[PDB]
């Protein structure tokens, strides 16, 4: 499939990107950073967007327009590269941890009032000021279900990231809907929701500022407190007749 080719291209980007000139020397930037972060205990990296464009313009162009699948492939590639760089791990740490990839770019920021409906499921960069936050709750990623009658088990079910659930099966494969989630067989991550307010100068005359709901996950939680000026990079998505609430899956924060 094309997914394997895209994953291989992302792995090649991670393993082969270098910075510097032959007059001084060359240093691999993302492989070294991945090794250092994984050894330190922080499982994340900050991948710029101009670097990916310079390596492969098509790959960067597929991240500015279909961020979901391409970001998932990039995270899997980062996990594989991090696993191969630190292959002989000490006893007890054989299992490889999952890596979270954060994005950054130097583009001119947009406005909250400029977000049209055409730019849905696209990477956006909007500034603002945080005015609210919520308690750090839990969000599941891997779940296992079990039948109530015949106690059949279907494990390792994956749940999509963001404010999206998982429709449970009806047929038992034992009445209708016999499946319940096993409590202890669930892997969870951190989870927080913020509220971004339009900048005090971009607000037009004689009008109250507008707001926008944000979503933060894993290492992005507990990074911004109310009253901070931030620049947010995230995926515009949806959570009256046909009206749907829209939020922003945050994949990068630059506190000012």
């Amino acid at each position: 499939a094309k997914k394997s080719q895209l994953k291989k291209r992302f792995r090649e980007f991670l393993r082969q990107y270098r910075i510097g000139t032959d007059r001084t020397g060359f240093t691999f930037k993302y492989r070294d950073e991945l090794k250092r972060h994984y050894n330190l205990g922080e499982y994340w990296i900050e991948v710029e967007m101009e670097d990916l464009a310079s390596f492969d313009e098509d790959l960067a162009d597929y991240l500015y327009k279909q961020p979901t699948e391409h970001l998932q492939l990039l995270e899997e590639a980062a996990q594989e590269v991090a696993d191969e760089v630190t292959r002989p791990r000490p006893a007890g740490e054989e299992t490889i941890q999952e890596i979270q990839v954060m994005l950054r770019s130097d583009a001119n920021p947009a406005n909250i009032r400029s977000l049209k409906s055409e730019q849905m499921s696209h990477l956006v960069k909007i500034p603002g000021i945080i005015i609210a936050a919520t308690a750090v709750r839990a969000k599941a990623t891997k779940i296992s279900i079990q039948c109530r009658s015949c106690r059949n088990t279907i494990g390792n079910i994956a749940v999509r990231p963001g404010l999206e659930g998982y429709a449970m099966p009806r047929k038992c494969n034992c009445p209708l809907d016999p499946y319940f989630i096993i409590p202890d067989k669930c892997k969870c991550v951190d989870f927080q929701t913020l509220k971004l307010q339009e900048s005090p100068d971009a607000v037009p005359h004689g009008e109250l500022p507008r707001h926008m709901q944000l979503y933060c996950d894993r290492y992005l939680c507990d990074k911004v407190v109310p009253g901070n000026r931030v620049t947010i990079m995230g995926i515009y998505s949806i959570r009256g007749v046909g009206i749907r609430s829209s939020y922003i899956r945050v994949v990068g924060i630059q506190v000012d």
Partner: protein, 175 residues
């Protein structure tokens, strides 16, 4: 021992150059320099090769081990054995860095060579870290570090030895 001194010990290996100037035999304190005939190979120490290339007076011939297939075989062998493995040269990292930085238009496929050497280096460094951790955890008094180059030792030295000294002092105090 800083990395510059480890490079200083790696600037005495033998490499083949093809000069353009003409010169007769030179009697150096460490050996006899072969007759310099244009378009004729003459083996020289690595420092001389680097100086000649920087002064535009030669054309460095890549070493034998600097091939994609051989390096892939070495990398696959390294990622297979638990302990360290013999290397094509005792100064592979310094040789690779110097040759690929100072003469890359002569060496073909430099990028893949630099990408494979880095993988081998990363695997060996991870093995060394495991060795250090196991040494300290088990409170041992001896370790067999075979086939380990000087730069990889320099990476973690002056930290391993001092930690071991302090551990020994704290280990025999009641005696």
């Amino acid at each position: 021992m800083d990395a510059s001194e480890v490079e200083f010990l790696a600037e005495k290996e033998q490499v083949t150059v093809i000069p353009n100037f003409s010169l007769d035999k030179v009697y150096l304190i460490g050996g006899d320099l072969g007759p310099f005939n244009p378009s004729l190979p003459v083996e020289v120490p690595l420092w001389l090769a680097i100086n000649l290339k920087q002064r535009q007076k030669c054309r460095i011939v890549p070493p034998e081990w600097m091939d994609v297939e051989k390096l892939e075989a070495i990398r696959d062998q390294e990622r297979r054995e638990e302990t360290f493995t013999p290397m094509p040269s005792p100064y592979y990292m310094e040789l690779t860095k110097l040759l690929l930085n100072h003469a890359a238009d002569n060496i073909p496929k430099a990028d893949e060579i630099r990408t494979l050497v880095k993988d081998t280096w990363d695997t060996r460094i991870a093995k060394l870290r495991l060795s250090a951790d196991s040494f300290v955890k088990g409170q041992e008094a001896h370790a067999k570090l075979d086939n380990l180059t000087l730069m990889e030792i320099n990476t973690i030295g002056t930290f391993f030895t001092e930690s071991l000294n302090h551990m020994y002092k704290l280990r025999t105090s009641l005696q």
